[PDB]
Amino acid sequence: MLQPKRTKFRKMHKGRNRGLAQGTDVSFGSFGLKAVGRGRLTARQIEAARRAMTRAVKRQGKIWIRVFPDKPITEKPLAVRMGKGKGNVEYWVALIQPGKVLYEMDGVPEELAREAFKLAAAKLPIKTTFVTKTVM
Amino acid sequence: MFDRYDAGEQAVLVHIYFTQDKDMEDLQEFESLVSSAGVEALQVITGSRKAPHPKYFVGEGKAVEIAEAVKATGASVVLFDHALSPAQERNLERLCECRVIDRTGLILDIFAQRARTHEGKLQVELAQLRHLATRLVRGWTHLERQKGGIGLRGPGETQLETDRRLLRNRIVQIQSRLERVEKQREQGRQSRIKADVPTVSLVGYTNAGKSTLFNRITEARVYAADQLFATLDPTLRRIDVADVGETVLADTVGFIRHLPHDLVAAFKATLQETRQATLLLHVIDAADVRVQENIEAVNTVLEEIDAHEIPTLLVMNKIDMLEDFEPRIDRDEENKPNRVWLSAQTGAGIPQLFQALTERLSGEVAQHTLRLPPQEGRLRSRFYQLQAIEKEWMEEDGSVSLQVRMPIVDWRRLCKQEPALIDYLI
Amino acid sequence: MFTINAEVRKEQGKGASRRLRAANKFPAIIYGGKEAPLAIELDHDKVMNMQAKAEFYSEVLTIVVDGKEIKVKAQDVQRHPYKPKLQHIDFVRA
Amino acid sequence: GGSTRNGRDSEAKRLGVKRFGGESVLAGSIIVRQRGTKFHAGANVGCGRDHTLFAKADGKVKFEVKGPKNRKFISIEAE
RNA sequence: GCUCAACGGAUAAAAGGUACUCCGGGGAUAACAGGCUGAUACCGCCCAAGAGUUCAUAUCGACGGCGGUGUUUGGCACCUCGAUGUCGGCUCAUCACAUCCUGGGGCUGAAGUAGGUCCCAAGGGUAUGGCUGUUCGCCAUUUAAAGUGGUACGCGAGCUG
RNA sequence: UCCUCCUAAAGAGUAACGGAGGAGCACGAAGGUUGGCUAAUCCUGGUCGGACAUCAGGAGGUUAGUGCAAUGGCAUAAGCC
RNA sequence: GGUUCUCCCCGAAAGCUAUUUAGGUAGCGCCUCGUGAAUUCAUCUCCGGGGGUAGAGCACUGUUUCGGCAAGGGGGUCAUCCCGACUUACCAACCCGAUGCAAACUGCGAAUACCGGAGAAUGUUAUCACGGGAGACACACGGCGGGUGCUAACGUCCGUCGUGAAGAGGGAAACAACCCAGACCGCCAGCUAAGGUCCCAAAGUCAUGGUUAAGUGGGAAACGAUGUGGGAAGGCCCAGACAGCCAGGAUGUUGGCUUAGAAGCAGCCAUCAUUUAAAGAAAGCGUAAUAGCUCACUGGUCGAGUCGGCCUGCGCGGAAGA
RNA sequence: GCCUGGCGGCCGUAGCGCGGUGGUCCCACCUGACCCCAUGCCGAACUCAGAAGUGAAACGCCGUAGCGCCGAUGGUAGUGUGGGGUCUCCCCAUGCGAGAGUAGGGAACUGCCAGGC
DSSP: OOOOSSOSSSOOOOOOOOSSOSOOSOOSSSEEEEEOSOEEEEHHHHHHHHHHHHHHHTSOSEEEEOOOOOEEEEOOOTTOOSOSSOOOEEEEEEEEOTTOEEEEEESSOHHHHHHHHHHHHHHSSSOEEEEEOOOO | OOOOOOTTOOBOSOOOSOSSSSSSSOHHHHHHHHHHHTOOOSOOOOOSSOOOOTTTSSOHHHHHHHHHHHHHHTOSBEEOSSOOOHHHHHHHHHHSSSOEEOHHHHHHHHHHHHOOSHHHHHHHHHHHHHHHHHTHHHHHHHHHHHHTTOOOSSOOSOTTHHHHHHHHHHHHHHHHHHHHHHHHHHHHHHHHOOSSOOEEEEEEBTTSSHHHHHHHHHOOOOOOOSSTTOOOSOOEEEEEOSSSOEEEEEEOOOBOTTOOHHHHHHHHHHOOHHHHOSEEEEEEOOOSSSHHHHHHHHHHHHHHTTOSSSOEEEEETTHHHHTSSOOOOOOOOSSOOOOOOOOTTTTTTHHHHHHHHHHHSOOOSSOOOOOOOSOOHHHHHHHHHHHOOSSOOBOGGGOBOOSOOOHHHHHHHHSSSOOOSSOOOO | OOEEEOEEOSSOSHHHHHHHHHTTEEEEEEEOSSSOOEEEEEEHHHHHHHHTSTHHHHSOEEEEETTEEEEEEEEEEEEOSSSSOEEEEEEEEO | OOOOOOOOOSOOSBOOOSSOEEOSSOEEEOSOOOSSTTEEOSSSOOOOSTTOEEOSSSEEEEEEEETTTTEEEEEEEOO
């Protein structure tokens, strides 16, 4: 799930992770989960965190997923020898940099938001924090 | 492997459990549940008296037809109805462009889709290990092409005997895991029985309205659809009866038409609660035109799990849909030993089922009132706290008579070793 | 009140900014459009405590730099990515 | 099915660098495979074929941006 | 005049078997074992949707997360190809504790009996047979129990083949 | 064997059983010169015309096109008569 | 496989191309000897350049998320298109604002490196050309930039640098490749680099200021916690501050609903203040209903400190092998 | 010294939009075409011969920032060299230093020659 429908090329290079994140601030909603840390979030992890928050807020308020898994992470099978091409495309991840806000939410109070975001934070591998909207 | 077949993929409709020599002619019976499996009925291929060839388990004309159907539809998987030998399956998948996945392979796939717990997933994993063990050697031949036959030194046994031993170690491990799950089920059984709590287990044909019977009884929502194995997991909700008192019902997963014996043994190793149930709630449906083969097969499955020998309150489903004969309440005997034909899946037969709960509990009509102790206020408070009676009446000289009675227990506490020096009863 | 003591920056650059945040100051810039910009350093905890209130950004704010009481307003905020701290603020003279 | 194929080249870039004393015709920019982003103005017309810019006179290379479309042009100043 | 397309083209012209093999070399290169790694495997912990009459944590744990071991399938080809004998059984062992029994405890959805689960604990103990070459496995009958792993998947200058 | 892109680190180069695609031609005009002209796409009104034909107007500016892969190109057009 | 006496000087490579080639060989690059040549070559400074990498960015190519609204398409009544009954509380498509992704995207674009010119200083002409003799074309690790793998490996394949190879010596317990530094010989002479000064074992049981109480130092994550040290704020206060502690706490609110339980014990209506130092149509645990407890508050005289969160330094548990 | 036409430099502070304004000096329309020449038909366009008329359109000029466009300072990212912590990543010293925003700028400037007061 949460895989792009059309992709220009099937497999993509492994790459390295960027230094920091753009998209730090909360703009869609009042309350947010901002990652403090570097990592890869899988699509199953993103789905699990969103499911945790929506069960917590009980279909009240709106949840925004501000990240999307566009990175094809490819894995070779068991008992296969090295070489003989790249591996077949097994899952879709999103590279998370420090400072990236990943989830926004509105229409719930601050304590409900903080509980929902901590239940997401347990699911995600990266370390995260609660952030709130500010005026500039 | 963690990778699996893609859901929503096209498939042909040749594979309809056994078309012949098992069940009956039941094209439609497998067709409905495979629509529940998720492949749409674009084109159906049917074969009569299909020749059990040593080479393919089918004649070449039907092999050409099923190959043409799968390549014309563009379906990812070729499908075979009869459970066939792995080598004939290998010959057929060599002849076709796409590989053929077995009968029990797709039945395991739909079982894994319907399974939402690790206990059911462990049962499916055991049967999947059985099916994969049947087809491993033909699969491992292409791997041994890459191996080149190397590995002669070391394991001094025959070749693939070592990997057969590895599969056997998988069998040993999953036997240990299923024994652990059975230990958890035994702990749950010791939890649910208190030597005074009647328990009923809901069995029968799958998605035959037995879950809807539980829904009407307990007012707890069940999952009901055209799909088979919509209801899998048992849930236990307490309900109140006027005569029985307190009872609980657990919705055990039903049987497909002719469950395989491997699937029977798998769910029997998963749960023993059907055998350990004091009473059984069996719901038998007339969905097939030929009901008797269904009753015989499902009752033999119940005897395999030793639950038919437990008294079964038989629920005669589809009978209310036909309305050939109507449920009635009559006090014919104190046991009332009549086969209850009520179809309470719509809830039309629930008062007759309440009298059937009276028929399955100890239900003496005469109902001899117990002798009242001189201290009756504590007894009245206990009666009001446990179950306040719908009708309260008092006999002459202060005697209180009510429907719930415990005569043998009353005898044990009122006269075991007591001196009876006062001798109020003469 | 919303009045901050700030110091005019003796040195300017990447190393100067990092040494300032190590010494618990953060840089800021004041531009007016009628005279030259002035680059200042301010104590991070004080400007954080004032920016906690929204009236930091809403109304005018006064800075004292070298004894000149300069009235100014918050224009742009640069915050640290994964921490409470703020790196820089850009000020429009008012 | 197979992805391992590539063509070979060993020059497709500039050679004179705005201070060459390029003599007679010398390739300013060889196999550039384009004309607009490297056109020729000063040493009459270069760019005969394959869009290789050759100096029509001896002198120094000049790189400039000129024109409405802001294209950069290679010229040669004679002494 | 060249699908001399093995495209810097051996000649105009050329397929295989070898367990009957032989020679010169290689640990430059697979099989055993060791070694790095630990994806997989085993064990543990994190969140707790829930099943449990109600009650997330008596006992299980959904979707996901983080580790530990070297312990199964693998990855690599560092070591030995101027030789490190292959599974299994017999004889004899020795260690770790992720404890099968016996010992000491906590919770229990622990009345007693009997249990489940977890903690501490390595002193000792921890079957005989039918089948099959078998480790296994299934079966018969025991027992307090018939532990799990390491030791060149312990042990062929100890035995068997 | 050859061509194009990326790997390839802003000169050139650069490997793998790395990730994607092509070629083993075509045209004596699809070549040379001279003269002339610029398209995708949408809106509106109209023949047996309708998401889609042929026309007229307005937006849009190369989003077209290139004999064939991709990259570089291309208004002086290398695009079209 | 072996290849036999000595001393002095220089001193590589394990790459590219091709090969019936892959452990061989030829050319070139690299080594050595000889001859000739110009301030040739190098460093640095200044002046000329070209780029599309890192980074950014979202116009283009694809990809995303939200908020706006219909051209047309399920449909909502419609064998009502109503040339009008709203264009359904559907997708609106372009579009417009806001947010991200890219090796095969660029309206931007470095540091570096490369090339060219000029100027000193320095270098045993280091540079080029021709000729004589070769070896080598099996590389390893480490740092950086990457492909592949699992952001595995003492893995595999590249670019660049360093070291081994072919380099001893001191350090890292021992240790090709990591750090320091390049051995002509001799010295029972000093100074020092890395690393260290309690004994093994040469040199501080040095001086000052602070930290940790686990042998952290001297193996390991998510996660858990009134460990301990700082810092900036917040609530409260001798018109009295922090716990436990003794009194009150409504029957008109106890009115119904699985009935002599109706209320707060499934659920709902309901939440006036009378006679508020200070009183809930009871929050929780509940009570056989009936009991209760702690809290809205005051005397509590115990009398100056007490409650949580944020950032940060070092500790603790997670943490089991033959 | 005041405007129009041509040819250049410059190449969005140079363009687009909005509003006004100009006359046969120039320019564009305009009047005809069996002449020169022309249309896969097209005095559309191209030409030629020119009488009336018009500045509408086009064109030019003026004002307008509504946009395109330019655009600091400061900060950030990156990176060469030396060193440090070295889960994939960072930090320190030092030298260089973006892009994106931000304030602001912004309705072009200039040369040569012909015609008219």
